[PDB]
Write a protein that binds this ligand. Sequence first.
Ligand SMILES: O=C(O)CC[C@H]1COc2c(ccc(/C=C3/C(=N/O)Cc4ccccc43)c2C(=O)O)O1
Ligand SMILES: O=C(O)CC[C@H]1COc2c(ccc(/C=C3/C(=N/O)Cc4ccccc43)c2C(=O)O)O1
Ligand SMILES: [Cl-]
Lengths: 150, 149
Amino acid sequence: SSPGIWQLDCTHLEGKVILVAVHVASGYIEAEVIPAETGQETAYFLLKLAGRWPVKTVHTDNGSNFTSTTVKAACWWAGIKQEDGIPYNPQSQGVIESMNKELKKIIGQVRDQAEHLKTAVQMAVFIHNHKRKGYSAGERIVDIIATDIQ
Amino acid sequence: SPGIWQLDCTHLEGKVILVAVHVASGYIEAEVIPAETGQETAYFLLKLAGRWPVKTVHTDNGSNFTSTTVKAACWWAGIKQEDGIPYNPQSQGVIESMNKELKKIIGQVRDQAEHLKTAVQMAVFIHNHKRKGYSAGERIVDIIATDIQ
Ligand SMILES: O=C(O)CC[C@H]1COc2c(ccc(/C=C3/C(=N/O)Cc4ccccc43)c2C(=O)O)O1
Ligand SMILES: O=C(O)CC[C@H]1COc2c(ccc(/C=C3/C(=N/O)Cc4ccccc43)c2C(=O)O)O1
Ligand SMILES: [Cl-]
């Protein structure tokens, strides 16, 4: 059920890890900088996400997070169906790849305005979600979910 | 009114919980911080505005209203920074009641989480999903979707 489907994505910059959740149907994202991708960090990130949006299903970004007892506990707690992230549809890889490149580009364009990477990442989230493509990802996610509620 | 948020700072376990409330829906986001500085508040607002269409923020106190860092974040994110003076006196009691409710939920989950920040995010989840019959999460999406359309 596509209003509730999210995909996890982990990318790297400046020796740090950027964890991204993408609302598949809209392209809307949330993201955080973490020192390393652990089960505990991923679990906490998912808890935050699911408190903020109606997360029904998460396609996990790798097998370690899929396997993680802590991630499984968070998904249980928050009522999330934890699934694999195998791109049975091969265009999924390229879409995530393209978004990571886009995000890193935006981070570069703002990096000087922020002392810390985490600030630049949140600026990138803002720019990404507001970008008009003509609706924005932020507009699309609200519309999709509102239509589902109705 | 679809774009109006209110900041709220409350305390528990010698730590600070910073809350943003979407006034029309009662929907919240929250974080635990060591202390409420301009820098922490600024970063919190940047996060919020990247996630929801934040037009106006009623700041929680005069220090954050005055803060150059908070003003910079509001400028960056296109947020109108306003005071949080309750010209409508029922605003105080509503925020008061929510802080009490949140602390209650935190108590009900505190044992399930080692760290306060986890308990706070559990509380955010429970608050936003609670049916009152629609939930705050349902109301915010409906309000904003109607505004877009
Ligand atoms: O560094 C960061 O940002 C996050 C680091 C840690 C913060 O603390 C935690 C964390 C990750 C997990 C936990 C534990 C959970 C449970 N244990 O049963 C049940 C549960 C249900 C849902 C979510 C988390 C937990 C904790 C915690 O124990 O509080 O992420
Ligand atoms: O501890 C935590 O979680 C948050 C602490 C810090 C994280 O870093 C920061 C922070 C708060 C502020 C900044 C600086 C900003 C600017 N300077 O011009 C312009 C700007 C525009 C918008 C938002 C932040 C900033 C930084 C930073 O410089 O990166 O919050
Ligand atoms: Cl304080």
